[PDB]
Design a protein around this ligand. Structure first.
Ligand SMILES: Nc1ncnc2c1ncn2[C@@H]1O[C@H](COP(=O)(O)OP(=O)(O)OP(=O)(O)O)[C@@H](O)[C@H]1O
Ligand SMILES: Nc1ncnc2c1ncn2[C@@H]1O[C@H](COP(=O)(O)OP(=O)(O)OP(=O)(O)O)[C@@H](O)[C@H]1O
Ligand SMILES: Nc1ncnc2c1ncn2[C@@H]1O[C@H](COP(=O)(O)OP(=O)(O)OP(=O)(O)O)[C@@H](O)[C@H]1O
Lengths: 506, 512, 529
């Protein structure tokens, strides 16, 4: 009942690498994933794969828990962890079959990890010029939106560029929470735009198109028949007693909307449905009524202006209301939306509205937009850029093998295997593009031998050659490559450190 | 029954890997033993790699090619034959670049044959010239093969036997300097005596016994007559028998048989010989005339034996006994002797010349000691054969396998193309020869092989091998594990020739 | 029903006949081309033979199936017709059956497939014969020198390709002789390739004549002779015997002596009749007597002894002389004057290192020559001799058959475009028969691309992209006669590379493969007894 007992901890992580190796790159394949609520979904993002695939082996859960740390401090390269650290554990199995101990590979990996953190600042070619221009920003964002939505990057690189420039004067406060995404059904991606302030997809149900009131109250309860918090035994016998309750319901709701006018609040948000007679009372006292059925659309407004959602039927409470500058309506893309604009304030809220005919298609654009904001959320720190497309993966594999050859002793075996694990990432890019991977690696090492740096893969099915990444405009993030190498090495050293797994009762 | 596709290429890998895994630990003088079970219940515990794989029956036809090619390897050299099969298995064991990288075999073959000329030129660079005239230098070279044997107590005598045998067979007047052990170095055994009594006869010895006592026993000036046809009545073109029924017909056939037999004997005794050596048999009536003239009658010799006798005393091979001339005199020979030494007759016609041949005289107290000295001296003559063919030595013990594999790593940096990935696979497959020497001694394999490669990248590549006995590193210039170049070149040529043979095989087809 | 076996009919015998025939194509799929892979031929005894030649594969392949037994006989119709082509018929006809098997499932009767295949085959010969090349360009214009240089690239001779390709081009054009009504062909016998140690491989010389590897012996006899008479004989001038197995009886001792004096006296009589003819070139297989060589150094006859028998058959064919087996003319002894003698111009004993050779010049009718492969050792000379023999047969088999065609995938790629446009011109339930005939011809570059370790979807499509432009517009910017270089993995012109194939190996391959695919497609019922 025991065969190897050290190989089964690695084979569980090799299956986790295979679910994202073919899904790597701009030529990567999509995944037909099934939601837990029985919903069909088509995506190719690496973070949405692990969220739905409930992996159960705890040896492969270390790389998944490393992906949750990969989502922190950087929003770039979750697929880089599942490919590179998967190639670390696959190449480490060739050393253990010879007779090498597992503790010798551990100290040899941490030696080559600190050596790879010194060669990576030497490969920084360009940097951002901090001009806050749409030509400088969209030139670097065109590589990050690639490998998410290929072919439609010409419309996505300009829209997120117009959102992040409006936040860059607010220095030290740029984040992904300031740029929100609201999806509106429409024609396609060509009709999409970008707006300022908080934009919701639902229009104002009332007849007010513009109001300058600051007091905003949110009530999650729908507009229906009022129920007393006490017992409240209400009995009806005849038709005249039913009309006394029907007219008395409208008369009490007339005093309910009058309490909103007494506190000086002309903006009300209702989570549930609104009755037709209660909608007439809101338009009488010039009150803007916006219906928001989504709970995440209601929770977004409490964390911005402070207006809380109360369960009671319109309570006149002055303490739990929010504050905004100007709430109005705007007609963009043949659809009226509500804008929570900040006129007196300088403003740091931007909303990118996305249009599309398929909800399964518009959700993949939302993961491509939030990964585009997270590329420049990293660039609020020290600006360093590295060439992409497998350009840095060969030069880092060239210097480590040159370093491990000159170093004598038993530690030269784990350093040489640390460089060949970087070769799997151009092997993942060449295989997904329909090109023989053994020819591109030989074409990459032949041009890097002569000193022609910044050379990556030519993205073409018919051309197995290479091209320059500096003239092509392909650039990655150095901090995106810095935390990816450190977290994948710390994850792959954790799986090799654990030998056997024993179940225990609580 | 029939296989096609990539299962044959992966099937030929495991067919050759299971042969190399049998004799993987059978390398070096610290080799381990094996257990061979017989269907009769017996067990032979031999440690010879040629004897292990010969009795093993195999069913894969690709595994059949590993034995019959190595059977031809025993006829060429007699040393290092198990090192070929380990190199044949390790060259085909790296199946990652074979099938898992989707590479065609023509890519691997064009890289393996481009590794062959780099494996040949590197072995000629680390060589050393040999002073063949000194006998003390040729004593230490046979010590790698005479050790762990019973002839180690008489190593000075066995060195003198193999050196004088290889120098007489070598006919260097043609330029090519051919050596023929199977033809001109016929080894014979003499029962009785001790191992120290063994010597080398300067000529040809014939194991023909003595039938009639009226023969020449000790003649100082022998006269050898070499013939091809037999001494009997002349038959026709067919093989029909002459039956006799009438009584008068018995006198007619017998008088022409008596006249033809005595005529073929009377023209031999006109030269007054001492020993008659003919190719075919001798009849009973011819033996009556041979014992009348009191001469030795020798029959049943080969055509190769008749060529060496005629060059020993200056005789000439004549087909018929009625056409002999005055040139067929065996003068100049040393002595004639048919003395029964150890219950066996031996014909001594030795002399003081070099007729491109020799004869080894084996002595021993029993047949068990005579069988031990025969197989041990045959390996001694094959080592000195490769020395006189090309006086160049390569240091063994893993020093040659690390000197070449260090050059293949340096040459792989400037070798562009897709073939550079299996080009490094030949260098790592050559490291299995010093790998198993650490495994057979008992030291740590990966701990000592890493420091072995670090000694080759800095210092000279002709030095710092692996001592299989003590287990540690030693210099090859201090201890004599020097192997010939013709053995190491024939090993590396055959290991590529069997790697190019099994990799070309794509389909297995049965039928005639 | 009670019969003497099992009966099976329908389309299930059509699908079983094409699966048994295409499995034989997989036996000869990887072995196609000069880079073909070896395959093991397991015998019933237990031994195995490693052969890669496809003609020897199908001879030893024994499949007890009647569908596979049909493809066995076309190997006998291929060697008896031309001598080459064999496995290219098998891959074409099996892919013809596999595409026609898809037509049976697509509600097409095979009768339209059989009649459509014969019209597709006859139009294939018409498009081939309209795009041929006459056998010419022997001197002055290269598609030759470069033609033999590709065959010479696999060995160590390919370092200096231009030096050794000139030795085989002028040797092929030297052995040309019509001999029947203006045929000209090339004989199976060729130049004799000798070797020597001329301190490097660059000292090879193109000798315009046969060179004998024999040494004349004595030096007092002059080595330069001017006379034309050449004598060839097989009987020994040494002491003769009756038979190797039958002997004459010698009883008296003085009788033995007088037959040796007669042997010394009858050798004086035979040399009087040989030198009376004036023949100085004396070549004897059985050897020359020692006192007989004394008479030749004073008369000036160039006597050579211990000559090989197969070398003398090319010498007697050179000067037009007759080989004399016995000198006794059934009652006495004569020399057969003016019968066994030829004519020549000059025989010089050239000083060649380690073998002083005998060269003959301007004989009666020889047309042969010799190449002295001077080198450094026996390793480089033995591999260069088989390289010259392999390069000789490449230029020989092309320049025989009276017109040639650029082959190596250039024939079938051009036929895949013309036969598709011809298929759209007929109709009448045979358009799919010719359109699948064009796609079935594409397996010849498809198996050649997978054996050249290249991408088969790119290398075959690069052949059809160039051959389509020759049919669209007749402008010279269109690449025409584009072959397939399997070494570099890039298509090139066959006129520049010199890759040529005979027309009779290309015509009879398309003729035999369609007639073999017709016979298997006509099988609709199986009867066993
Ligand atoms: N078109 C391209 N040109 C050059 N390099 C590319 C291209 N597309 C992807 N890459 C390379 O792929 C790696 C990042 O690719 P990818 O966009 O798949 O990661 P990611 O999907 O952003 O990670 P995450 O899953 O966290 O979003 C980088 O090393 C980059 O060099
Ligand atoms: N005394 C020794 N000390 C160290 N190494 C040795 C010694 N003798 C032999 N070797 C090593 O062993 C290798 C040969 O191994 P092995 O003895 O199995 O082959 P062999 O028996 O000599 O030849 P063959 O196997 O064909 O008979 C040589 O390369 C040499 O370096
Ligand atoms: N010089 C050349 N260059 C490129 N391809 C060639 C050349 N010569 C031959 N070929 C190709 O090789 C194939 C010949 O394969 P092979 O010689 O292995 O068997 P075969 O001769 O077809 O069998 P058979 O003897 O029945 O006809 C031909 O189809 C041809 O296209």
């Amino acid at each position: 009942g025991l065969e190897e007992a050290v190989y089964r901890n690695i084979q569980a992580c090799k299956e986790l690498a295979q679910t994202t190796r073919t899904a790597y790159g701009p030529n990567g394949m999509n995944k037909m994933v099934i939601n837990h609520l029985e919903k069909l979904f088509v995506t190719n993002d690496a973070a949405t794969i692990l969220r739905e695939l409930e992996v159960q082996h705890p040896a492969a859960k270390m790389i998944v828990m490393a992906s949750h740390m990969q989502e922190q401090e950087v929003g770039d390269g979750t697929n880089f962890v599942l490919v590179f650290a998967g190639a670390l554990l696959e190449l480490a199995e060739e050393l253990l079959r010879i007779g090498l101990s597992v503790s010798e590979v551990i100290e040899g990996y941490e030696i080559a990890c600190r050596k790879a953190h010194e060669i990576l600042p030497n490969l920084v070619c360009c940097s951002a010029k901090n001009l806050r221009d749409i030509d400088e920003v969209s030139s670097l964002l065109r590589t990050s939106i690639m490998s998410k939505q290929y072919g439609n990057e010409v419309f996505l690189a300009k829209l997120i560029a117009q959102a992040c420039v409006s936040i860059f004067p607010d220095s030290g406060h740029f984040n992904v929470d300031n740029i929100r995404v609201c999806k509106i059904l429409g024609s396609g991606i060509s009709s999409s735009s970008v707006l300022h302030g908080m934009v919701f997809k639902k229009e104002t149900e009332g007849d007010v198109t513009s109001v300058k009131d600051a007091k905003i109250a949110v009530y999650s309860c729908p507009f229906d028949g009022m129920i007393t918090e006490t017992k409240g035994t209400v009995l009806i016998k005849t038709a005249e007693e039913l009309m006394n309750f029907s007219k008395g319901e409208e008369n009490l709701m007339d005093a309910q909307v009058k309490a909103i006018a007494d506190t000086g609040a002309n903006v009300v948000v209702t989570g549930g449905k609104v009755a037709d007679m209660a909608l007439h009372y809101a338009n009488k006292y010039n009150i803007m009524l916006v219906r928001l059925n989504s709970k995440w659309d209601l929770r977004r407004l409490c964390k911005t202006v402070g207006a809380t959602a109360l369960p009671r039927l319109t309570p006149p409470v002055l303490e739990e209301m929010g504050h905004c500058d100007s709430v109005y309506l705007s007609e963009v893309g043949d659809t009226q939306v509500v804008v929570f604009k900040h006129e007196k304030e300088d403003g740091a809220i931007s909303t990118i509205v996305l249009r599309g005919s398929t909800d399964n298609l518009m959700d993949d654009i939302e993961r491509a937009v939030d990964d585009g904001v997270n590329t420049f959320k990293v660039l609020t720190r020290d600006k360093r850029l590295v060439p992409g497309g497998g350009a840095t993966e060969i030069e880092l594999a060239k210097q480590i093998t040159s370093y491990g050859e000159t170093c004598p002793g038993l530690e030269q075996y784990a350093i040489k295997k640390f460089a060949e694990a970087f070769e799997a990432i151009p092997r993942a890019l060449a295989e997904n593009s329909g090109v023989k991977a053994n020819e591109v690696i030989s074409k990459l090492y032949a041009v890097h031998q002569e000193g022609n740096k910044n050379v990556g893969l030519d993205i073409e099915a018919e051309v197995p050659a290479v091209k320059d990444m500096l003239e092509a405009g392909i650039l990655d993030t150095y901090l995106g490559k810095y935390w990816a190498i450190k977290l994948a090495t710390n994850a792959a050293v954790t799986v090799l450190r654990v030998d056997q797994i024993i179940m225990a009762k609580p | 029954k029939r296989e096609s596709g990539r299962k044959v290429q992966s099937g030929n890998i495991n067919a050759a890997k299971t042969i190399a895994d049998i004799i993987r630990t059978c390398l070096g003088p610290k080799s381990m033993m094996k257990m061979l079970l017989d269907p009769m219940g017996g067990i032979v515990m031999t440690n010879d790699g040629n004897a292990i794989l010969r009795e093993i029956q195999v069913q894969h036809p690709a595994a059949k090619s590993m034995i019959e090619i190595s059977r031809t390897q025993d006829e060429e050299v007699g040393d290092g034959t198990t090192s070929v099969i380990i190199l044949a298995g390790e060259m085909l064991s790296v199946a990652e670049h074979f099938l898992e990288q989707q590479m065609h075999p023509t890519v691997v073959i064009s890289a393996y044959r481009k590794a062959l000329d780099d494996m040949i030129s590197t072995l000629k660079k680390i060589s050393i010239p040999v002073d063949i005239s000194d006998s003390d230098m040729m004593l230490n070279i046979i010590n790698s093969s005479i050790t762990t044997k019973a002839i180690s107590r008489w190593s000075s005598l066995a060195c003198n036997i193999a050196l004088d045998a290889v120098k007489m067979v070598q006919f260097e007047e043609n330029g090519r300097k051919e050596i023929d052990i199977k033809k001109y170095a016929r080894v014979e055994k003499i029962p009785g005596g001790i191992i120290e009594d063994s010597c080398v006869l300067r000529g040809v010895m014939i194991n023909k016994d003595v039938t009639h006592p009226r023969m020449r026993r000790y003649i100082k000036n022998p006269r050898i007559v070499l013939l091809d046809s037999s001494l009997e009545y002349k038959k026709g073109e067919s093989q029909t028998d002459i039956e006799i029924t009438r009584e008068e017909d018995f006198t007619r056939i017998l008088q022409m048989e008596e006249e033809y037999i005595q005529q073929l004997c009377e023209d031999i005794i006109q030269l007054k010989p001492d020993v008659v050596i003919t190719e075919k048999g001798i009849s009973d009536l011819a033996q009556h005339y041979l014992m009348r003239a009191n001469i030795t009658a020798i029959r049943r010799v080969r055509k190769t034996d008749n060529n060496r006798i005629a060059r020993a005393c200056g005789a000439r091979i004549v087909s018929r006994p009625e056409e002999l001339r005055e040139d067929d005199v065996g003068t100049g020979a040393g002595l004639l002797e048919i003395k029964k030494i150890g219950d066996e007759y031996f014909t001594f016609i030795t002399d003081c010349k070099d007729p491109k041949a020799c004869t080894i005289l084996l002595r021993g107290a029993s047949k068990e000691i005579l069988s031990e000295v025969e197989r041990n001296l045959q390996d001694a003559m094959q080592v000195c054969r490769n020395v006189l063919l090309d006086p160049q030595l390569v240091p063994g013990g893993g020093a040659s396998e690390m000197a070449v594999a260090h050059a293949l790593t340096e040459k792989s940096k400037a070798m562009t193309g897709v073939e550079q990935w299996p080009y490094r696979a030949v260098a790592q497959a050559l490291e299995v020869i010093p790998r198993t020497l650490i495994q057979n001694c008992g030291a740590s394999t990966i701990r000592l092989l890493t420091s072995l490669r670090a000694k080759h990248t800095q210092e000279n590549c002709e030095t710092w091998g692996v001592n299989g006995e003590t287990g540690t590193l030693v210099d090859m210039k201090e201890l004599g594990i020097w192997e010939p170049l013709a053995v190491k070149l024939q090993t590396y040529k055959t290991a590529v020739e069997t790697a190019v043979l099994l990799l070309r095989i794509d389909d297995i087809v049965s039928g005639h | 029903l009670s019969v003497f076996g099992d009966r099976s009919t329908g389309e299930t015998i059509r699908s079983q006949n094409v699966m048994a025939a295409a499995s034989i194509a997989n036996i000869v799929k990887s072995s196609l081309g000069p880079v073909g892979l070896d395959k093991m031929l397991v015998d019933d005894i237990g031994d195995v033979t490693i052969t890669n030649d496809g003609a020897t594969i199908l001879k030893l392949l024994e499949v007890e199936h009647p569908a596979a037994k049909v493809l066995c006989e076309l190997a006998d119709l291929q060697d008896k017709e031309v001598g080459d082509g064999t496995t290219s018929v098998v891959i074409i006809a099996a892919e013809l059956l596999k595409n026609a098997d898809e037509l049976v499932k697509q509600k097409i009767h095979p009768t339209s497939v059989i009649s459509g295949y014969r019209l597709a085959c006859k139009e294939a010969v018409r498009y081939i014969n309209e795009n041929l090349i006459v056998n010419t360009d022997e001197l002055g214009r290269d598609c030759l020198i470069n033609a033999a240089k590709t065959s010479m690239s696999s060995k160590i001779i390919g370092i200096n390709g231009d030096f050794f390709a000139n030795m085989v081009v002028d040797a092929v054009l030297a052995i040309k002789y019509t001999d029947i009504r203006g045929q000209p062909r090339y004989p199976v016998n060729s130049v004799n390739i000798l070797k020597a140690h001329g301190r490097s491989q660059m000292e090879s010389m193109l000798i315009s004549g046969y060179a004998l590897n024999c040494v004349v012996g004595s030096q007092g006899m002059p080595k330069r002779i001017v006379n034309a008479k050449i004598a060839c004989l097989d009987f020994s001038l040494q002491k003769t015997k009756m038979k190797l197995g039958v002997q004459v009886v010698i009883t008296d001792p003085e009788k033995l002596d007088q037959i040796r004096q007669r042997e010394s006296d009858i050798t004086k009589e035979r040399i009087q009749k040989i030198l009376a003819t004036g023949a100085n070139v004396i070549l004897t297989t059985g050897g020359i007597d020692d006192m007989c060589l004394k008479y030749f150094v004073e008369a000036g006859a160039m006597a050579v002894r211990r000559v090989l028998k197969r070398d003398l058959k090319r010498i007697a064919k050179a000067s037009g002389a007759t080989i004399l087996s016995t000198l006794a003319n059934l009652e006495g002894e004569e020399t057969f004057e003016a019968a066994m003698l030829g004519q020549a111009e000059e025989v010089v004993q050239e000083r060649i290192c380690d073998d002083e050779l005998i060269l003959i010049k301007n004989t009666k009718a020889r047309t042969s020559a010799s190449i002295i492969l001077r080198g450094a050792n026996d390793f480089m000379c033995d591999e260069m001799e088989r390289s010259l023999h392999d390069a000789l047969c490449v230029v020989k088999r092309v320049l025989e058959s009276k017109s040639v065609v650029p082959g190596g995938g250039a024939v079938e790629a051009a036929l895949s475009i013309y036969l598709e446009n011809y298929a759209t011109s007929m109709g009448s339930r045979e358009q799919l028969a010719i359109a699948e005939f064009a796609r079935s011809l594409l397996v010849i570059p498809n198996t050649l691309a997978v054996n050249a370790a290249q991408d088969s979807t790119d290398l075959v499509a690069k052949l059809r992209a160039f051959h389509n432009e020759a049919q669209v517009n007749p402008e010279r910017k269109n690449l025409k006669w584009i072959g397939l270089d399997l070494s570099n993995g890039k298509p090139r012109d066959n006129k520049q590379a010199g890759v040529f194939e005979p027309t009779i190996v290309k015509v009879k391959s398309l003729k035999f493969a369609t007639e073999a695919a017709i016979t298997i497609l006509r099988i609709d019922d199986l009867i066993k007894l």
